[PDB]
Design goal:
Shape of chain B: globular
Number of helices of chain B: 0
Strand content of chain B: under 5%
Chain A: Peregrin
CATH superfamily of chain A: Bromodomain-like
Strand content of chain A: under 5%
Entry title: Solution structure of the bromodomain of human BRPF1 in complex with histone H4K5ac peptide
Radius of gyration of chain B: 6 Å
Oligomer: heterodimer
Largest sheet of chain A: none
CATH architecture of chain A: Up-down Bundle
Keywords: Human BRPF1 protein, Bromodomain and PHD finger-containing protein 1, BR140 Protein, Histone, transcription, nppsfa, National Project on Protein Structural and Functional Analyses, RIKEN Structural Genomics/Proteomics Initiative, rsgi
PDB class: transcription
Radius of gyration of chain A: 15 Å
Distance between the termini of chain A: 40 Å
Assembly: dimeric
Distance between the termini of chain B: 10 Å
Number of domains of chain A: 1
Structural class of chain A: mainly alpha
CATH topology of chain A: Histone Acetyltransferase, Chain A
């Protein structure tokens, strides 16, 4: 595989590899096995995973940091929509929401520094 | 019985 035809596009390659270091259980690293959950598509309206993130990125689908951030939030939320309030998988999605929530902040500022516009709040 | 990953509660 190959990609990164613009300096903004290169940020997303290295950032996706930093979100992959926030899943130490490999729960989101791969797609949910339908062979043990055949009803997943009847309960989840927009299913996603880290392989689909990578494939979309290698297919030039992400031209703004907002969509790359929002599809990570979608992957977190799709766990929380199909689990019980006491499982490993539930708390693994809470772990991504916190730890990789920082990864999207530290990496957005590499685009904002060259996108220009206003500052502070 | 059941603890996530099968669409069942109550």
């Amino acid at each position: 595989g190959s990609s990164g035809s613009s300096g903004f596009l290169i940020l997303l390659r290295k950032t996706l590899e930093q979100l992959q270091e926030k899943d130490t259980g490999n729960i989101f690293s791969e797609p949910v096995p339908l062979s043990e959950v055949p009803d997943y598509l009847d309960h989840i309206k927009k299913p996603m995973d880290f392989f689909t993130m990578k494939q979309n990125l290698e297919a030039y689908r992400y031209l703004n940091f907002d969509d790359f951030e929002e599809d990570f939030n979608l992957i977190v939320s799709n766990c929380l929509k199909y689990n019980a309030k006491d499982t490993i998988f539930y708390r693994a999605a809470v772990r991504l929401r916190e730890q990789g929530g920082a990864v999207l902040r530290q990496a957005r500022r590499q685009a904002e520094k060259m996108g220009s516009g206003p500052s502070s709040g | 019985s059941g603890r996530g990953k099968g669409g069942k509660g109550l």
